[PDB]
């Protein structure tokens with residue numbers, strides 16, 4: 001029901017990461033100076049329970065380690081009648097997004113063993129949500145963040161359409177498919193699109209008008225990596241993420257036992273190389 | 283070249299609270315005059331009385347740049363807010379006629395100069411302190427935006443594999459915008475945007491929910507919302523629609539609005 005005021009517990013600093021996420025802030029735990037991400041929602045009485053929802057979502061399902069964890073929520077009263085402001089507070093991921101990571105890499109491409117590592121983490125996080133019957137619904141490079149520590153965490157899980165390039169065929173509505181059937185395997189598609197984003201600096205169809213991409217995704221065969229340089233194992237993993245008909249798309253668990261994710265011998269060095277890459281740019 | 287906006291304009295705040303994005307309310311540091319300032323990280327059509335006038339640009343460098351685009355400031359806020367702030371989420375019928383006419387007047391100007399607004403909706407239709415209606419955000423990206431004011435030809439779909447923008451798409455949006463004024467929401471608002479993108483091309487033309495509206499109003503809606511854009515009238519043709527053409531109470535209307543602008547302010 002009623003919560004608490006943030007004043008003297010948390011503070012904005014503020015504003016991430018260019019408004020791209022909306023009303024989200026770099027914030028700080030006043031007592032310890034620990035950073036944290038902060039969502040600020042203007043509230044009413046019509047929203048009321050959608051809010052009550054957003055919270056139980058995070059509190060329940062944020063406790064894995066591949067998911068940015070819930071911190072707590074706060075009510076920051078506004079002048080009577082006016083709109084109050086809700087403070088959704090979570091773990092802070094200081095090393096930016098995968099989108100950013102690839103952006104900042106010469107030739108905008110990640111090493112295979114990096115892609116393996118990051119994919120696995122995404123899959124571990126997704127596995128956790130799926131086992132709780134939550135569909136993420138918006139896996140793309142931007143919703144996948146690094147910690148200072150090279151830990152991987154998912155955000156923004158559970159009026160605009162926004163960007164379509166990471167969308168699975170089954171979630172775009174058309175005559176064949178008038179009700180857009182989000183299934184848990186939709187996430188896995190987006191995971192495959194994200195791996196390509198890491199491999200190539202951008203999703204398939206990036207060069208197209210988004211309206212056009214939205215039209216094409218359901219009709220094209222599975223996207224493929226442009227280059228032949230990649231390992232068979234990786235070609236195979238992409239092909240698994242991007243089975244056109246989600247009915248035949250492997251489960252999260254099935255993909256976690258995919259050799260490309262499973263057999264990561266050099267992950268030791270990868271986590272190291274990653275931290276280093278972060279710190280330099282840091 | 284392009285001045286630095288320091289000493290000339292101060293960003294007072296983000297307008298519509300993020301709604302329009304990185305667009306602020308600025309104030310001239312010396313003169314006090316207000317403007318809208320669209321801020322962009324980077325690498326002669328507005329001087330019609332129904333198009334918010336463009337004041338010019340400033341340059342703020344540099345990497346690790348930001349471009350400033352300055353434009354007249356519209357005090358009374360969007361007509362989306364106006365409807366919101368109107369008891370019963372409905373504007374008065376002759377309020378809608380006057381506003382629609384002003385929309386068409388701006389569009390005509392745009393169209394005569396071969397420009398497609400591309401994004402008519404209650405939010406891109408703004409009011410000055412003095413009850414003047416003015417258009418913003420005309421025909422300037424990775425995000426499919428909000429679908430509800432979108433004309434059918436603009437949506438890529440099974441028989442429209444290549445979306446068509448056409449000056450006539452604006453008139454469809456004008457029609458939806460009038461419904462918004464009537465009911466506070468465009469049709470299918472209750473729908474998930476993805477679902478709405480699917481139905482706009484498929485469904486018959488949307489309609490007012492209420493039977494209380496005048497014949498002329500139903501007709502003007504009907505006129506704007508011709509599904510096939512090839513068979514949809516011009517801006518100029520619609521200006522001649524009785525609903526737009528015959529406004530006796532224009533005077534009372536302007537009055538009634540200026541007032542509201544202050545009252546509900």
Ligand SMILES: Cc1c[nH]nc1[C@H]1CCCN(c2ccc3ncnc(N)c3n2)C1
Nearest residue numbers: 021037038039068088091092093155156
């Ligand atoms: C903050 C919040 C509270 N409830 N839901 C959220 C989401 C909003 C969408 C972006 N998500 C980010 C975006 C940027 C970020 N940057 C750093 N750390 C984060 N956790 C972070 N999270 C968090």
Ligand SMILES: Cc1c[nH]nc1[C@H]1CCCN(c2ccc3ncnc(N)c3n2)C1
Nearest residue numbers: 302318319320334351354355356418419
């Ligand atoms: C500022 C700008 C520069 N180039 N294009 C614009 C548009 C961005 C979309 C919103 N548009 C608004 C929104 C709210 C507003 N509020 C008051 N006055 C305005 N002119 C105004 N304009 C203006």
Ligand SMILES: [Mg+2]
Nearest residue numbers: 063064065067
């Ligand atoms: Mg966790």
Ligand SMILES: [Mg+2]
Nearest residue numbers: 328329330335
């Ligand atoms: Mg003007």
